[PDB]
Amino acid sequence: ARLNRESVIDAALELLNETGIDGLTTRKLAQKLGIEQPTLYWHVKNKRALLDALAVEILARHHDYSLPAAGESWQSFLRNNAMSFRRALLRYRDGAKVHLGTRPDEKQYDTVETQLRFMTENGFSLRDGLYAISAVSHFTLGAVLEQQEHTAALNLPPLLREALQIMDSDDGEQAFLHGLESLIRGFEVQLTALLQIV
Amino acid sequence: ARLNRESVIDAALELLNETGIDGLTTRKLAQKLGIEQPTLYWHVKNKRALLDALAVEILARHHDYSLPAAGESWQSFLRNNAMSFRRALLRYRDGAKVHLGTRPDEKQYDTVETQLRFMTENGFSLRDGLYAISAVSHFTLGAVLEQQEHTAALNLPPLLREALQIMDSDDGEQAFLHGLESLIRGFEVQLTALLQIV
Ligand SMILES: CN(C)[C@@H]1C(O)=C(C(N)=O)C(=O)[C@@]2(O)C(O)=C3C(=O)c4c(O)ccc(Cl)c4[C@@](C)(O)[C@H]3C[C@@H]12
Numbered sequence: 383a384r385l386n387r388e389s390v391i392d393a394a395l396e397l398l399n400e401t402g403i404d405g406l407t408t409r410k411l412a413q414k415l416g417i418e419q420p421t422l423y424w425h426v427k428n429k430r431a432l433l434d435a436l437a438v439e440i441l442a443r444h445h446d447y448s449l450p451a452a453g454e455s456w457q458s459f460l461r462n463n464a465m466s467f468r469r470a471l472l473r474y475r476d477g478a479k480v481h482l483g484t485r486p487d488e489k490q491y492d493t494v495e496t497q498l499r500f501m502t503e504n505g506f507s508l509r510d511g512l513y514a515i516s517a518v519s520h521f522t523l524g525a526v527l528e529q530q531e532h533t534a535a536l537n538l539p540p541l542l543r544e545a546l547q548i549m550d551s552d553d554g555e556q557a558f559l560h561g562l563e564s565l566i567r568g569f570e571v572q573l574t575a576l577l578q579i580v
Numbered sequence: 581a582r583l584n585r586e587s588v589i590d591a592a593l594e595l596l597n598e599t600g601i602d603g604l605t606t607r608k609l610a611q612k613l614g615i616e617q618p619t620l621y622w623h624v625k626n627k628r629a630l631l632d633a634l635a636v637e638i639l640a641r642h643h644d645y646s647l648p649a650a651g652e653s654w655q656s657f658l659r660n661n662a663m664s665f666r667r668a669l670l671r672y673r674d675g676a677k678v679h680l681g682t683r684p685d686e687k688q689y690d691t692v693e694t695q696l697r698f699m700t701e702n703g704f705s706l707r708d709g710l711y712a713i714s715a716v717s718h719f720t721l722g723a724v725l726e727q728q729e730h731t732a733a734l735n736l737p738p739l740l741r742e743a744l745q746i747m748d749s750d751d752g753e754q755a756f757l758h759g760l761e762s763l764i765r766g767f768e769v770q771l772t773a774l775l776q777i778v
């Protein structure tokens with residue numbers, strides 16, 4: 383096996399799709415790579431080091447809308463950025479549980495710094511721009527996690543029976559997209575209100 | 581040990597606080613209860629059966645605002661219900677990862693049926709009332725999961741340094757509460773718009 387960082391990240395992503403996150407271990411990864419575990423240890427010290435790097439790589443590889451287009455509104459940037467974030471988290475089995483708990487890596491510093499500056503340039507204070515960006519992140523992580531965990535870990539009253547048919551009718555994309563519009567409209571109301579009672 | 585359902589759920593909650601969810605196993609629970617694992621098997625068939633029952637019990641025990649008060653508005657019910665849901669999920673180590681992926685249990689049928697009927701009585705269609713209730717659930721699960729997983733699994737530019745001080749200044753409660761108001765205001769805009777272009 384070639385054991386530079388990119389081929390270790392590639393076999394580990396491959397293995398996450400096959401086993402999920404609880405079945406991903408350095409002993410299984412060494413066997414996939416066809417090397418002994420001391421050989422693997424030289425490259426990958428532990429499972430946290432590995433999950434930290436996968437969380438960065440899945441967004442580097444798949445999260446394409448990380449910055450505003452030139453002249454794009456803050457509303458449009460949040461919509462687009464959230465949908466790209468959903469799409470990157472859903473690309474791999476347990477992608478959202480791999481993200482959970484990470485913080486921006488050094489490789490992401492400039493990207494996330496730009497996102498926050500862009501909201502302050504749009505009128506938000508830093509804290510309000512942060513609370514908007516975080517509410518979009520938490521709603522998206524929540525929606526993808528319920529979806530992915532629902533299919534991993536596997537007498538009704540009339541409206542629940544029907545709620546359950548609706549829920550299960552697609553990937554959760556329509557419920558997501560409609561909730562996203564409500565979130566962005568609530569922030570716009572708050573932005574424009576300024577100091578008036580809203 | 582007494583091994584009726586309530587004392588097994590009690591020792592298992594106790595054990596979840598000590599070990600977290602990945603260290604919670606029927607072998608560790610049998611040792612906590614001081615019985616042999618065949619004795620435990622008669623009562624608890626497996627870890628999924630156990631996590632399913634804990635997800636129901638933590639809300640039964642701690643989620644107190646599950647129904648609207650008499651005369652309460654839909655806005656106020658969503659605010660209060662979300663905060664109670666956050667509070668119940670945060671009461672135990674990995675409480676939100678225990679919830680993840682469950683669906684309403686038979687013991688919760690009447691409660692969730694009422695919640696959906698209440699939104700349709702407030703003007704929502706069933707699907708729109710469902711999308712509002714789900715967006716509140718997903719945002720709350722997302723915010724508590726990022727919080728709990730951030731503390732479990734353990735050169736900055738100026739606005740990220742400052743974002744990071746703000747984030748970490750409390751439990752995530754202010755970011756949660758502010759995002760909650762934006763979500764509820766976005767649904768109200770959408771409810772009242774009816775068929776007009778909004
Ligand atoms: C999904 N989108 C809203 C963000 C995004 O697109 C990111 C990105 N690298 O392109 C993120 O890292 C993010 O997805 C993301 O994961 C962020 C993040 O985790 C976070 C945390 O943990 C603490 C402080 C801060 Cl400043 C952040 C924060 C706001 O930078 C976010 C940004 C979101």
Ligand SMILES: CN(C)[C@@H]1C(O)=C(C(N)=O)C(=O)[C@@]2(O)C(O)=C3C(=O)c4c(O)ccc(Cl)c4[C@@](C)(O)[C@H]3C[C@@H]12
Nearest residue numbers: 545549646661665682683684688691692713714716717
């Ligand atoms: C946090 N709050 C919005 C809800 C709540 O308070 C519940 C409760 N038992 O009191 C739930 O079970 C909920 O927290 C909760 O977990 C629900 C839930 O999981 C869910 C899923 O999985 C699929 C279909 C439906 Cl109809 C539901 C649904 C909308 O009943 C929700 C309700 C939320």
Ligand SMILES: [Mg+2]
Nearest residue numbers: 481484485486
């Ligand atoms: Mg993140």
Ligand SMILES: [Mg+2]
Nearest residue numbers: 679682683684
């Ligand atoms: Mg639920």
